[model samples]
Target chain A: VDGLLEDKALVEAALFVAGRPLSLKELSKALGIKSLEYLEKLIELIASEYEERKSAIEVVKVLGDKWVMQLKQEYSQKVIHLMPKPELRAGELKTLALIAYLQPVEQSKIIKLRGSQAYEHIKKLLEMGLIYAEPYERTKLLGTTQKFAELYGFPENDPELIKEAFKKVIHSEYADLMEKIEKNNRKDKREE
Target chain B: VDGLLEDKALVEAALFVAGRPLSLKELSKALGIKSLEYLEKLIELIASEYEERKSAIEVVKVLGDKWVMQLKQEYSQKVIHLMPKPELRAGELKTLALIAYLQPVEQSKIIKLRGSQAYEHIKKLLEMGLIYAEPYERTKLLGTTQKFAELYGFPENDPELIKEAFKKVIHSEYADLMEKIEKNNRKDKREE
Candidate 1:
């Protein structure tokens, strides 16, 4: 218990200074901890402590497997001046936003609507671990990764929730057209 | 007071269905009201009514002159599923975001940093009234209008707050570089 307490403080400080989300493995390996099993337990202990203190910071798991320390969504607005720059470019962001809104979608569908540039966009997003795709018959099905939700501080993995966050920055008129395209894509998904 | 109440209801409905923020002139013309004088008073009354009701909506003035009714920022997360699609395209949005972050900046500064394509982006944003500009040393000084803040539902017209909102949707990796350019632009502004 005493050793765990020291580990908690170390973990908290590492995440705070990281200036961005750190994966659990990244956090642990950086601290010279050998096993993920102990790290997970220490992370849980840290999370409960913050929750109990009603602290503004939190330990959140994003993209299914990665844990990050960040300000709670409700409190982010209060300290938005301290926000870090986003890492993605405008075109890449557009492609990622479309994928998040139209999850379980065909890669060819995105390519058709956005042109061949989308192929490059998808490749970049995949390399960055913001999106994931699965082989679906002849093509890939696209969706956002948990990292996407965490990086943007989205409330959850719900597609609608992610879209709601995306609409705040991106203009919505384009989304309406994208939504219509998604409807057609859905029909195509069923045919294939 | 009776006429005030009736006018308030009409203004409220118009703003609700506007999809985007409405200018006072646009509101008055759409409702067939001849006097902006009365319309302005009526808008104030409606703004207070929503505040008194603790409603999720409120009336706001943007771009120094335009009035709009839209969701309060705190409550937006609660009903984001009901959010309207934004009307700007990706490149246009990128330009607007940059202006919000670096207000009172020069058009040439943006064009120089983002390349000449930003020339087209700025023109479209100007036509939409989301941004405004003034002559500055043989070029234009670009900054966001109140319409930009109100349309995006920024808490206030404070450029920092608006920039904070812009950061949420747009990835910010370029922001570090953009900041350097803004520093140089500010020096140029001082020299002139």
Candidate 2:
């Protein structure tokens, strides 16, 4: 009765409460297991299920983590229409733009640069499950979100891994250079 | 030709440099004019141009005093790929989710709930431009980007307006409650 179903359930459970992305480390800790390879296999299973079902949402890899979520680019428009409406005002978009562009930047800087009316607009954006904050004393940093990734069709679970994948796929041409650099390093080591 | 061209350039400049989102008053001040209605008309012209184009970027209205340029939801994937890549860690994602769920919240609160690593994740997210900061050092608010709204296909550069549109289309049943709570409060009370 409980064969692969158990593994799917476990993966889903790990993804469900993982408000953000879940790394292999976190998943291992939660599942009382180690071995990222196994975890990756499980993720493959999960991703395949979502693909097979043709669900609007899917489990995906980000950096080296996983998040169960929406199809970012594929279904962004549809889901944006489905979620609670956000209530930003005029320059509020500018405020968000600065944050997105220069995130982990000081919110105080934004106010100083843009003015103070943004306070209310910031509050409204917060209410919409789009942006988030972390303290930096006088400065609170802002940035884009996983929901941003998931809804927009970028993988939400492991941005780094995806980036690496991108590099692997697109930048494989540079592998020879890397090998040459390694050879030079070895020669330098022999000289030393 | 000089007079009209200079005036047109002024309006375009107002929209460009007013990064956070510009209100009529702010635009008037930025343009050194008392009658901001001209700028408003210019913005309408800009908006009309956006309608004519097929790009995913546009200006947004946040509150009465602010406006921001935002990317459309449908085009977020391509644009995001164009931007510099930043790593998305799981702890950071979780922390962001908490902040998104309860925005404009203090950094202290996020730290308390998610632990110190949350701080680091918040920093990374900010750098990626997925979120933006709100100043008001007292409360230290945070919110999502209008680019995010655009990423999700919300028209215009305003989150509030997008939400309004969403309500009309997605949640018509709860539309009335979603209306302005204190109708005549902030928009006209432009003292500060």
Candidate 3:
């Protein structure tokens, strides 16, 4: 017997083909369907099946509403070499990690902590649109942008979400750095 | 009426989930199917359906035997920001372009043409494993790894495949640089 598999299949195909997150509007436009709730349900169904199957590929929601079909981190890490590796240097990547982990942070404080080299790192991250700057009292405030959120699969640029992810992904890579920042944040707050 | 939808769906699911090329062996192993021919037929069927529907997502055969579910270039270009934008800088990327475009090239020749900065670029690329080196006469010879093949979808890392892609993706970004390399390569050969 036939089932209502057309829409579900199309949604999966679109996400698969896009190879990136499909926002509500873009996915609806692609599918020519307008029932947002229905689409969301279908995506939920798709995600559920993958979960039940314990498939290494996951269908994930990004930035509150967008959907992406991708390999789970466990698998993707092994095959990242199969894709164009992002060529960010160690310090630059560290700077980005800090900005993302404790976003909406004071830019000068980051520069002070990360040293003068952070100036260039911040500029490059800005050019890459991974971080954005705002006017703070004497310096700038920085936060992760939508681009950063999606890349790292944060449903929102919530500090807590990033913090949890930092602990998981960077548990070994820079756990010390994260702990250092945690200590410094409170120290600065107390002084301020 | 029910058709052979199970195998078809599983193949699509695997490709979509892997988010990378699935070789003949991998697909069979994942699906628990032993018939390589049957699996390939199912993949062909999937690719055909997408193509027939004129869907923006295409299922493609990569590297002669592997299959991938991916978005077509026309659409992926518009949504790349939703993914981890590879952070390669201009000059370094240019160096990579040369190596990829005309791979299995001479490291010394690349250094002479690209100047001293290329020495650093080449080393970084090696560290990234995008390019591999071999002993050549008094210097080293270089070529892309299978990782590079898959990232760019070159399948074979063949000169012609990469050359065509270079024209398309970098048509405007560095047409002159590619052309310069082309000229330099031929001139060097002529002198030798």
Candidate 4:
């Protein structure tokens, strides 16, 4: 296999294994190939070479940048059960969202907003390494980690960038929740 | 990369990409590794080599035969939303289960058991390749497919084997549904 062709094979191989949209940085690190442009070219090539026009599986760029090889969007709702696996419960996911948005936010604020069950979410998330905690007086500070960045396709652990990426991806329900949290924090700030 | 070490890496890569339980046969085809024993040995090596005892991701043998690399069962509910993908809706999954169990069964019978909504499930399942339909008088016959077996990690598409596998894996709610379908089918046979 020529170096160029083999890179294509490797790119497909990596995409196939991960089973979700992957950032170019993630692919580069996994494939030892650099450059978003080059990676894009390779992925596009894979898409082109798949000349089976009626192919159900596809290579798509979601959220403008992240690439994935998966069943088309239409199929997702119908066939989502095919790859059942462990997932974040609704409460845990919301807690995770809160921590992602307000990295290093107080555990107290989360409990106040999310109720006592959040404590369990925080404990489990710590075990999942999606978030990290540091002792801060009576409470711990919570923030996302590099592994979280890797899993969610954030190329860098920059909070603002990750926040913006999430804003578009989250549905209206979470969007409302994020707004509620913001308002709660604003009122809390006024009180403090 | 020695052959043995590289095989181990390839196994992990395959498992990671799949994001679901994979049979030894599936892994063998993907990795070009021949022996289930050698593949199992290599997988066990991968597991043991993961010396980080608290590691969140793990390799485990599911259903005593199929293997997967994923978060532990405890985390599935908490982190399921993370890799959200296409899933079969309740109606669709039930339709699929019926087809799997009573393969080559008529579409009309499904509509009777599952109601008018089964028409949509049957259409979508055909598109997803989870089930196939064949021409019959004034209708079609439905059955499970090779792709379904692969997705669900069945070693072979033998109907009885697949049915037995389903019996153990399906939860109690589905077990009830399966029984209902069976009784309905038995009564229908008597009537005929």
Candidate 5:
């Protein structure tokens, strides 16, 4: 009980308080343990525990590398009445989505693609800690952060996976639009 | 050749170009139509036109009063790549949802229930014209506006209808969470 259960409990405790997902490296560092394989096995055990208990929370792998504990989407709404919702508006979500999709992308290019409004959206996202920017020649290059992945429920390390997750969530929210896009994309691919 | 068809076309044109939903009063005022029945007939005709054409755009009555043209959710993704997305972030949406849920609710009560963050969410919502607030004692009273209904695709003017629509959207986004919550609510009620 003390061996496997202690490790599983430690992982659960870390995830419960972790505002963001913790990479195995981060988890090991925090837990004062060094075996990646052992931690991985413990995480698997913890995942099953929540599943078995039908708990609202679950452990998820964001990219392929990082894991975080988060509430299942369905349970979020049930208790969301008591939690503070994300402050970013749709415009910011769109901007963040664009940045996530085209990360390490030039700020000027985003402005060109999204127009001047992108500037305000980018600034707001920056202040919110959802994005990171660094000077690139004349303009800035923008990218998503760990906070962005944790908040939006995406993987932290891989851009492609993160973009795919972001697109799916956006599609879910705008189902009609996504279906049409899917149809159109299929048509375009056929034409190609 | 141009009697009813012309009126229907004019309504479609207005909806296509109008950035926001136009109330019946506003539509009548803008289209220079004197009879409400004429406008109503023309709108129904316009609805059929899009439905028949299988066009991406549709005319919806928000609050059963104002009418706006918007993309069907499916096709929205096709164009959203190039188009601007909604500006409301998660926090704002939650605040707006709460206001929709508990309209005529006191601002102080909302803050007390939702925490200090509700103040900022409320201010941003007011600025965006999604909610109307009137001074109440030391705080304000908050309620959804016609714009809120229109932008969010809710039936305008009916508080109960709007709440139902909002809950459905929230439920869809967090289906798993809601299911758990629903189950928990039953348990709580049973315990009582």
Candidate 6:
């Protein structure tokens, strides 16, 4: 029990400095400890310790297999100045905006729109925990994370409007094909 | 040169773990080496070594200062199972279906058809080296990669039918998608 506190701090620091996610096995190796009980205890202690802190960064566990240390959305707001705008390359920008916009949308829909190659991109985003997916209508419903919502200051759980805003940007960016999309969207809407 | 060989392996392993393209300066900083000159020397030597061995993976210095280690497409075919699968989420799938069906399409046009998120998604597809974008009359033309042809064993780049099949499989298992994809493609096509 006495060793738990020291172990907790080391585990947190390892995750923080790595600047990436780790698995339970990875965390164990990094801390040179073999016991799962000790690591879980450490994780619980660390998770609670930061619960009341005003700091922006904290640990988040995803799907029971991966863990990442991330900056709180509150912190992201203040750090925007220090951060360069996320000027994603042309395709990624399109993909991210689409996912963010139409989410709770499916992964298959994205590859369909972007062509077959987009398969890798969505996986990367999901792994980053920026998006999540669960079955809806016999297909996966994808949505942005609380982290994403907080960064953009959208009301939690209301991504539909953000999707609309993103779509508006796309329309303005390309006028020639606006009519085609409008036609298809109307058809799609009619199907529902 | 002996120590250099060990360092070369170290550098390659580091970049491999990075799992994406990295700049020379970034690698230098990560490796804690002080001088750019030595780093460049190392990279050059490593490049030649891959050539001599006809290694499956090689270092690529593309436009700009980006350096990446990618598996040769010819070999990626033989070991496709070991290669990472491209993940296409549902929203992305819809966007891709619309895009491929309407390729020679502009970046903004893809966005209009789908939404703004398509921009980021498209860019991500490109970085995976699975899609290619080119300058069109008024906007950048977006389409699948030549390697996409290779992955599916297409004899030539055929964007039209690929898009059609994608639409069919946006809601299917990979096995079903593969069958449809194979049926639609030319006989010379093969999957890695």
lDDT of 6 by residue, B1-192 (tens): 446545555565554444355667877766656688888787777677656744345677754475765655444333322222235555554455555555666687567545677876787577666677887776788777777666544546777777766654343323444444456454436542
Per residue, candidate 1 scores C-alpha lDDT tens digits across A102-143 of 676789988877889888889989998988989989889998
Candidate 4's error at B32, in angstroms? Answer: 7.3
Model 6 has an lDDT value of 0.60
Give the range where candidate 5 chain A is weakest over 10 consecutive residues by summed lDDT: A76-85
Off by over 4 Å in 5: A1-88, A97-103, A106-116, A127-130, A135-139, A145-192, B1-84, B136-139, B150-156, B160-192
Give the DockQ (2 decimals) of all models.
0.02, 0.02, 0.08, 0.06, 0.08, 0.01
Task: List model 6 lDDT by residue over A61-81, tens digit each.
Answer: 754466766665543332222
Best by lDDT: 3
Measured with C-alpha atoms, the lDDT of residue B181 in candidate 6 is 40
TM-score of chain B of each: 0.46, 0.39, 0.49, 0.53, 0.46, 0.40
lDDT assessment of candidate 4: 0.69
Supply the global lDDT for candidate 1: 0.66
Pitting candidate 5 against candidate 6, the one with the higher lDDT is: 5
Cα lDDT of all candidates, in order?
0.66, 0.52, 0.71, 0.69, 0.67, 0.60
Q: Which 10-residue window in model 4 chain B sums to the lowest lDDT?
A: B73-82
Provide the lDDT at A72 for model 3.
69
State which docking tier applies to candidate 1. incorrect
DockQ value of candidate 5: 0.08
lDDT of 4 at B25: 84
The local lDDT score (0 to 100) that residue A139 gets in candidate 5 is 84
The residue-level lDDT of candidate 6 at A28 comes to: 73
- What tens-digit string does per-residue lDDT give for candidate 5 at B53-96? 44445677764377766666554433333333456667667667
- Tens-place lDDT per residue, model 4, A107-163, is 988887788989999997998999999889988998889999867656478888876
How does each model score on TM-score?
0.32, 0.26, 0.40, 0.35, 0.38, 0.28
